[PDB]
């Protein structure tokens, strides 16, 4: 970890120690907080340009949450554990229209996450990897963000070598979970968008915000 | 007359004129709606549901009638003529085609009327299937009143076209679907959309 030290990141991750869908809709403003503190404490992040910094945040918002709850649920058997102190269940989840998304998460993300004894330093580094995403839209100095990235996994490779010597394929194994994270991140957007369209007169959010009471001006 | 076409007409006449449109659409829609004969007698709360509910259909009907004058094109409220090439290239070719075939052309064929159009707009507006209505029934009576009047006008004005009333009413299913397709399109573009989506949540 020459430049992006692994040790800082664990500190960074550690700092933040009825139907489920509202479960997160009402809930996530709270983790606007958690998300920002977390990004603050990664090593070269604060030093990037502001224009660039925000882009990463919106960009990685999707996955970073997911990754986080994915990891916390390893602690439990057959369930999802929210930041709100809410624990969700399959038979429950299966009923607000996200039955499919919830399973992918457990089978695709958690179990696999669990089966490898993923640990917070690992969780943190992966998350750091997503955050510093070069493919993000409109960065003024992208080749810059790409560079930060290399440093993160590089440290990551090293840490792996340390704690877990017998397994030399762990680093690769970790990286291979990112696709699953990314696909799951999109599928979520798909559930989120659908419920909007299907559910109701939806124009509204698109119409920016409602004030017709002064309809009667 | 419980609901008079003359009043319904005045409302249309009263509002004759990539969209950071809509502060304007909002003004046009509410100002038009207020003149509909029994609209402001409604619980204020219902009035919000209705305008918002039928917001998409009401505009669409509007540009279509305006557009008949244009040839193979649609004229937005902004006063901007849109054409196939422009439209088909820009991703809405599917919608534009329907609007003309399904909507504008038919309106053209029948020499649809401002009264008739305004009347069709009112029916759409007083929609009782709208979720959350304080009490839906009151709205149905208002809707029921509009078609009765509309029925009457056609005969008086168009005795030869006994078929005119249903013909007019029969455009509603077309107008409705076009609306949902517009929505499907608006949603896809956001989903597909550049940089990040869901940025969209207003917290």
């Amino acid at each position: 970890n020459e430049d992006m030290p692994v040790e800082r990141i664990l500190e960074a991750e550690l700092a933040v120690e009825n139907d489920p869908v509202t479960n997160i809709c009402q809930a996530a403003d709270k983790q606007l907080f958690t998300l920002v503190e977390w990004a603050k404490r990664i090593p070269h992040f604060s030093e990037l340009p502001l224009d660039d910094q925000v882009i990463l945040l919106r960009a990685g918002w999707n996955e970073l949450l997911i990754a986080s709850f994915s990891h916390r649920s390893i602690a439990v058997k057959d369930g999802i554990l929210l930041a709100t102190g809410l624990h969700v269940h399959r038979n429950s989840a299966h009923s607000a229209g996200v039955g499919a998304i919830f399973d992918r998460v457990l089978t695709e993300l958690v179990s696999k996450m669990r089966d490898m004894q993923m640990d917070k330093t690992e969780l943190g580094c992966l998350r750091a990897i997503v955050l510093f995403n070069p493919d993000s839209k409109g960065l003024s100095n992208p080749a810059e963000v790409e560079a930060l990235r290399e440093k993160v996994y590089a440290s990551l490779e090293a840490y792996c070598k340390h704690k877990y010597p017998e397994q030399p394929g762990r680093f690769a194994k970790l990286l291979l979970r990112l696709p699953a994270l990314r696909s799951i991140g999109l599928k979520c957007l798909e559930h989120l968008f659908f419920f909007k369209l299907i559910g109701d007169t939806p124009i509204d959010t698109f119409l920016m915000e409602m004030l017709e009471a002064p309809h009667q001006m | 007359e419980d609901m008079p076409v003359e009043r319904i007409l005045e409302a249309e006449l009263a509002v004759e004129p990539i969209c950071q449109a809509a502060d304007k659409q909002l003004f046009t829609l509410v100002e038009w709606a207020k003149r509909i004969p029994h609209f402001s007698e409604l619980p204020l709360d219902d009035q919000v549901i209705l305008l918002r509910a039928g917001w998409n259909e009401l505009l669409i009907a509007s540009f279509s009638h305006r557009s008949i004058a244009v040839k193979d094109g649609i004229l937005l409220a902004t006063g901007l003529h849109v054409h196939r090439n422009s439209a088909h290239s820009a991703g809405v070719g599917a919608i534009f085609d329907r609007v003309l075939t399904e909507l504008v052309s038919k309106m053209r064929d029948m020499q649809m009327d401002k009264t008739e159009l305004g009347c069709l707009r009112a029916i759409v507006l007083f929609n009782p299937d709208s979720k959350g209505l304080s009490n839906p029934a009151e709205v149905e009576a208002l809707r029921e009143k509009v078609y009765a009047s509309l029925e009457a006008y056609c005969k008086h004005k168009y005795p030869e076209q006994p078929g005119r009333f249903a013909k007019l009413l029969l455009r509603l299913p077309a107008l409705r679907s076009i609306g949902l397709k517009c929505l499907e399109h608006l949603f896809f573009f956001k989903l597909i959309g550049d940089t990040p989506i869901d940025t969209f949540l207003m917290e």
Partner: peptide, 7 residues
Amino acid sequence: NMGLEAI
């Protein structure tokens, strides 16, 4: 995004 940029 203005809301976002409160860091």
